[PDB]
Amino acid sequence: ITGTSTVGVGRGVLGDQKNINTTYSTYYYLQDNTRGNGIFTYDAKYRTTLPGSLWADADNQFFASYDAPAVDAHYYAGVTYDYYKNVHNRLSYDGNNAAIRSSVHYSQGYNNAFWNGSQMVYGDGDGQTFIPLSGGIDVVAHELTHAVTDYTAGLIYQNESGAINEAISDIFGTLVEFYANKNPDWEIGEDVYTPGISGDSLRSMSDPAKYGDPDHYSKRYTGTQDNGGVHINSGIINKAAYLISQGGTHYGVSVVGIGRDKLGKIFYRALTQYLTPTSNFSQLRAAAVQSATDLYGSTSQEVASVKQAFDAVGVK
Numbered sequence: 001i002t003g004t005s006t007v008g009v010g011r012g013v014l015g016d017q018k019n020i021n022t023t024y025s026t027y028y029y030l031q032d033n034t035r036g037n038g039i040f041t042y043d044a045k046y047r048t049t050l051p052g053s054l055w056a057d058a059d060n061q062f063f064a065s066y067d068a069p070a071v072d073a074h075y076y077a078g079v080t081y082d083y084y085k086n087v088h089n090r091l092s093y094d095g096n097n098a099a100i101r102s103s104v105h106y107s108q109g110y111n112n113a114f115w116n117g118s119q120m121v122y123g124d125g126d127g128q129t130f131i132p133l134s135g136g137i138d139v140v141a142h143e144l145t146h147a148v149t150d151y152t153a154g155l156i157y158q159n160e161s162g163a164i165n166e167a168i169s170d171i172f173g174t175l176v177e178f179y180a181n182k183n184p185d186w187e188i189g190e191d192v193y194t195p196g197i198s199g200d201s202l203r204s205m206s207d208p209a210k211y212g213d214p215d216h217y218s219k220r221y222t223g224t225q226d227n228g229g230v231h232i233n234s235g236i237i238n239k240a241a242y243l244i245s246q247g248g249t250h251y252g253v254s255v256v257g258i259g260r261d262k263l264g265k266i267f268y269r270a271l272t273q274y275l276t277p278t279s280n281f282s283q284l285r286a287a288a289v290q291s292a293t294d295l296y297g298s299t300s301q302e303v304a305s306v307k308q309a310f311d312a313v314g315v316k
């Protein structure tokens, strides 16, 4: 909508107060004009018609229970935009400041979130398995990273390319969570999963097997569920990324960690310059090796650690 840029205030899903960028034109809308061509947040009103209605509020205060998922979707899309721009010099998901659109209150009791090819979509959860999923910065950044991937490498969402697609989303979802630096970890979705259970998450990058996912190629899933295991086999790559950053010894193979910033630079370059729609795990190792060689040199510690990490998870 055409209007003037304003700053509202509200509370997110976990009860934290934050300022949001809004637009005033009769109502105050969740339209942030400060980032690219805009960040826009919509109400799906418990239905599945998308995007729904651009979020309108009479007073620019967003403290109602019903408001909280909107606040967080809007705010955390902004953080994710800021991460890509400030860390990687990328302007929105298409690199040309595309509008970022999200819908909240999707369906009833909907225990997921997704990128639909055009926008973000967040369920409210059923209140037992999940609370509204935009409450997780890593979840918001995971879903927006699918838009990045789709515009860049274009990894097909099945089998090994699909597991890479998912791992890239978990890696950058985690690096965004560290960038915002509130309560960061190497777990996925902990802030919105199972409010009745402390210390769990959907997936772990540090120890994928904690939630039943493989941490070595020899344990890969080869069945047909989950698009050939895209959220299962992602654990193999997630473990490699964890090892590259943090170091460790895994199945007797020691990796020297090089830290989060270098992990992000290596994987962002691989994603944007080397991976293709059909890349498999072997091709990801090659892309990461080439990326680290470009940035740091062939005889660098960074290259050595990339190789050691892929060796550790059985990917040649």
Ligand SMILES: CC[C@H](C)[C@H](N)C(=O)N[C@@H](CCCC[NH3+])C(=O)O
Pocket (backbone or CB within 6 Å): 111, 112, 113, 114, 133, 138, 139, 142, 143, 188, 189, 202, 231
């Ligand atoms: C990043 C987390 C987000 C919910 C994502 N779409 C995801 O990982 N979903 C998988 C895990 C289950 C989510 C709720 N049932 C999934 O398999 O869809």
Ligand SMILES: [Ca+2]
Pocket (backbone or CB within 6 Å): 057, 058, 059, 060, 061, 062, 063
């Ligand atoms: Ca209000």
Ligand SMILES: [Ca+2]
Pocket (backbone or CB within 6 Å): 177, 183, 184, 185, 190, 191
């Ligand atoms: Ca966390």
Ligand SMILES: [Ca+2]
Pocket (backbone or CB within 6 Å): 138, 174, 177, 184, 185, 186, 187, 188, 189, 190
């Ligand atoms: Ca996390």
Ligand SMILES: [Ca+2]
Pocket (backbone or CB within 6 Å): 190, 193, 194, 195, 196, 197, 198, 199, 200, 201
């Ligand atoms: Ca929990």
Ligand SMILES: [Zn+2]
Pocket (backbone or CB within 6 Å): 142, 143, 146, 166, 169
């Ligand atoms: Zn995903």
